[PDB]
Design a protein around this ligand. Structure first.
Ligand code: SF4
Ligand code: SF4
Lengths: 624, 626
């Protein structure tokens, strides 16, 4: 099938697309084909639905009609307001995730979270001292956790002048944010102000609207996401380099396969612990299974990969196909980027679709709500439902298509610095010498409009060939993994300088740094290098790219990378092209304001050319 | 012009529409006509733009295509998510307003707000004692204010189980909210969670989404709005009954006319103070003006009316027409519902359009940013700009069309209770006796799709005829005022029972209770009556109506009225009709959950029939006669 081949570059995707077609199961690609018309105005950003004087659409007509909304708003305001709410939704996704981590650490500190502990007490004391907890090195760990909880909760209040983790940014970058009015003050406050600004008759200046969009996204990267990353390491362990596998072949015919899906490790970490209890393992053996096999999907799978080495079944557009294998006995979901089509496809088989969060409700799903105080009990119940569903699996409909590909994961900043001997100096020297010319974080998703992982893999190959080290998060993890680029042996596919540095360190040329919230690790690493060198983040030879993005969260990540001084490439444009002024601001105007701008380029080789050109220019301004 | 007559019921609007037509000035009605080819999918709520796998539209096609979005979401999820974000935008409008009041009270308590004071120390001590401030009756006033500021800020945090003012609601209503998962916890938090829930692949159940929409709106009415109302009374005075005038005739040809527009009294109160300084009045007289005349627009005008008796120039669709009079020397705006067309229309005259808030930026406006620490200085500078613009006014293009209509305003709950002798008992006795059969809060805006104020005025007349007292806020204030219903003499236009009670108290049959944020006053009054009688708010003979609404803030008000147990009528439907399940939930399903539901009815007489039917049924459940 030429159509099936055009939808992905992977054999395991192709095999399940054939199977789904033979069984009459429609997938995300089929629904994408139906929605291709949609609305030109929605794509251009020139449709407004923010009050019922409208809806209004801005058109270019010879009679001059429909140039303004009923309230008088023009294309610039309407597009900027739509883009702002788009960003606020992405920031809110990371905000609630970070807030949930605070609640969990507070529950542990109060002794009200059976089965949860502080896995990394050393990191707890370090982070707490960094944020100003008195005597964080010597006081009882639960006292220290409670004080860190109070600081993090205060960043979710309305009385701070600047977020707590913002102190990591170099002084020149904080002074710039202050002059611009971009300093993030409260994680929830910026989201709430954006919704106020975008109400009819509030903020009607596209420049003002975009400035607060930067402030809202900065409250994510230096707030919601960074709190989520650091507290997750404290609760569940700081990642260290380890080996694992990826693709649909990680599912086992002889085992109970449980796929964790969503973003929150607070649930998936306890699911994993439940599968290790003797009575639970006995129920699986009583059912005829050889073992219980947990495999990861999306960001919560990335989290289990970084901290436990749990194999990854696939990324965004693989999620439906994982059920089509016939071996998915249960999907355990929390929230974000869980396509509701999985509920209907699970109904085609024996698969149980289990929801666990009060925020992630899916009509028709089996809801076993998980909170810290009952997670150990509830996650036990959830694994038992998976074992029961295993006994109802139809063996004739099982087809696990591929053999898993080996990967190396767990490259937190702590692991990176340890690999360098404890300081960033060897990394700076390699950059100064030109063996590593720069770094690019590839952090994108999948999008049905782009052949799955074609741009992710091509861009990754292009960059490491040019001695540009790649930092991979999100869906790119599975893409780079299946291409065999996440192992130390892949240095043979990097340039001479990068290959030599990788072989001397024993690391791959592509470092897996975690989930989408773990893009905050990349902010931290950039901030560390800039502070060490005494320059701004906008002076570093760095870049960010999302070749196949789709979600509001990806746009928020791109926005706070740009606002932090990181040139950011997107494979597809956001819904803003209906305003030339907003588009020019995103592509060019922001360069004069924050020292970086967006790039839109669907050709991954041309994308690599543009990212390299920025890296080269920044190398020149550093005198290298 | 038949078209001009069809656009409003008021003579002052007709004259300015005729004037605008001859001068080639397009108004909101003209732009509404251009946008009448409104997207069907946007109107039905079945278009989703929440990711760039889309946009997606759900259609009812013969070939069965486009039944689901690319992610698999159906019409129920897509409509419920769009409505949730719609509600969050309205709640965020009130949230930021209340937050600004907290900052102003904090600035006063620290002595960093020249020209601001605690105007109502007595209410400060009462509110602070109510929320748990230790020794609020005797401690220094600035110390008490600082502790109340801390309590209010904590409601804008993420560590509360329930908002502070939620304790006003009856226990039965709080227990119901708790079981349903509707208890509002943080003013900003509920807004943020709604944006998280409506992200792709998060909340994909329309019932769950609608329940959190109720929780988000409750964080407004019992949080952002209620904090805004009470702190505004503390900072600028608790309203008491007073006389004033309304309509475009409140503008004076011989004076410098300054129109305050927006929602925040922190700015308009200092503008008024600036126009009262002797040196500023001297510059106006030196320029040839008899005086400086401040007149109000929209909610900030409602606030100046309630606390200072400052006359109101007009409501939503009058804002453009006020500049067309040719006598508007300056518009001073803060934020919310300020149409950016005013900037272009001001450019057709001498009028200065001044913005004052970092949140309300308008391209091409004159920005003089106002904060508590510099408000006294900046507002003086702003009034001077108005005097200068007055000297450039074209006398030939001036046309102030009408004579002002007298109104009575200032009916805070404190004023109502004082008129009743200090307790609600005389009011309860009148309801039990059947002289006052029920209460309806009419809280709507204007909408170009409805002839201006035709439904607002007709519904108000229908209700008071049936002995149903009307509580008026927002744009309804100007509507009821211009019809002469905001004066005690209007008791002659009410039924026999309501007229007798009004004459016994000396009050109009329509009580102006303030701005849109002051709908929290109506929540407080309903909660007080329910608590006194030992029943739920859903047992009281009450209703709420928004016959001509348009904004997200209006939908948030309607949602938290319903969620609090108040049957709420809307003249126009929200963009939800593309989902029958969501529509059925809003119109019927919610009745079984929170004891009230939405009503959509564009006929104001039928709306009065439906509101009265609920009042009668609740009267029976209380064991009262009709
Ligand atoms: S806010 Fe303005 S542009 Fe948007 S729908 Fe309302 S009237 Fe139209
Ligand atoms: S969230 Fe779902 S329905 Fe909405 S645009 Fe994205 S794919 Fe389409």
């Amino acid at each position: 099938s030429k159509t099936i081949r055009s939808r992905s570059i992977w054999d395991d995707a192709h095999a399940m697309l054939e199977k789904a077609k033979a069984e009459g199961i429609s997938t995300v690609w089929d629904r994408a084909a139906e929605q291709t018309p949609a609305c030109k105005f929605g794509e251009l950003g020139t449709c407004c639905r923010n009050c019922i004087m409208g809806p209004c659409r801005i058109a270019n007509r010879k009679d001059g009609k429909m140039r303004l909304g009923v309230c008088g708003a023009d294309a610039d305001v309407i597009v900027a307001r739509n883009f702002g709410r788009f960003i606020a939704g992405g920031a809110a996704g990371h905000s609630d995730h970070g807030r949930d981590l605070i609640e969990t650490l507070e529950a542990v500190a109060e002794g009200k979270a059976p089965g949860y502990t502080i896995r990394d007490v050393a990191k707890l004391r370090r982070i707490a001292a960094e944020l100003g907890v008195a005597d964080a090195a010597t006081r009882p760990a639960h006292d220290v956790a409670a004080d860190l909880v109070t600081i993090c909760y205060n960043d979710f209040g309305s009385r701070r002048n600047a977020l707590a983790f913002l102190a990591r940014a170099p002084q020149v970058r904080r002074d710039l944010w202050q002059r611009l009015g971009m300093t993030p003050r409260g994680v929830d406050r910026e989201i709430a102000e954006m919704m106020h600004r975008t109400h009819m008759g509030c903020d009607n200046d596209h420049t003002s609207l975009l400035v607060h969009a930067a402030r809202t996204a900065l409250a994510d990267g230096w707030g919601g996401s960074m709190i989520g990353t650091e507290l997750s390491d404290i609760l569940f362990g700081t990642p260290r380099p380890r080996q694992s596998t990826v693709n649909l072949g990680v599912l086992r015919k002889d085992a109970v396969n449980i796929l964790v899906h969503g973003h929150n490790p607070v649930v998936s970490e306890m699911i994993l612990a439940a599968t290790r209890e003797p009575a639970v393992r006995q129920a699986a053996q009583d059912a005829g299974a050889a073992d219980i096999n947990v495999a990861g999907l999306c960001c919560t799978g990335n989290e289990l990969l970084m901290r436990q080495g749990i194999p990854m079944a696939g990324n965004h557009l693989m999620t439906e196909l994982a059920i089509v294998t016939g071996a998915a006995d249960a999907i355990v979901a929390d929230y974000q980027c869980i396509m509701p089509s999985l509920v209907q496809i699970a109904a085609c088989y024996h698969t149980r679709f289990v929801t666990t969060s009060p925020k992630g409700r899916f009509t028709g799903a089996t809801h076993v709500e998980v909170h810290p105080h009952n997670a150990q009990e509830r996650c036990r119940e959830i694994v038992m439902l998976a074992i029961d569903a295993y006994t109802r699996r139809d063996p004739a409909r099982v087809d696990i298509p591929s053999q898993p590909v080996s990967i190396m994961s767990g490259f937190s900043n702590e692991a990176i610095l340890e690999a360098l001997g404890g300081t960033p100096k060897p990394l700076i020297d390699a950059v100064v010498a030109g063996q590593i010319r720069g770094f690019v974080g590839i952090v994108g998703c999948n999008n049905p409009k782009i052949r799955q992982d074609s741009a992710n893999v091509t861009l990754t190959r292009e960059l490491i060939r040019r001695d540009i080290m790649v930092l991979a998060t999100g869906c790119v993890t599975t893409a780079a993994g299946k291409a065999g680029l996440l192992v130390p042996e892949a240095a043979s596919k990097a340039g001479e300088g990068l290959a030599a540095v990788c072989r001397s360190l024993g690391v791959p040329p592509v470092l897996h740094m975690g989930s989408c919230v773990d893009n905050s690790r990349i902010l931290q690493l950039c901030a560390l290098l800039a502070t060490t060198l005494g320059v701004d983040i906008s002076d570093l030879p760095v870049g960010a790219s999302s070749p196949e993005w789709y979600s509001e969260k990806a746009a928020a990540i791109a926005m706070y990378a740009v606002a932090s001084g990181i040139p950011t490439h997107l494979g597809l444009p956001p819904n803003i092209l209906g305003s030339e002024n907003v588009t020019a601001m995103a592509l060019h105007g922001l360069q004069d304001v924050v020292g970086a701008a967006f790039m839109v380029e669907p050709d991954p080789v041309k994308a690599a050319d543009m990212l390299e050109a920025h890296i080269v220019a920044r190398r020149a301004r550093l005198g290298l």
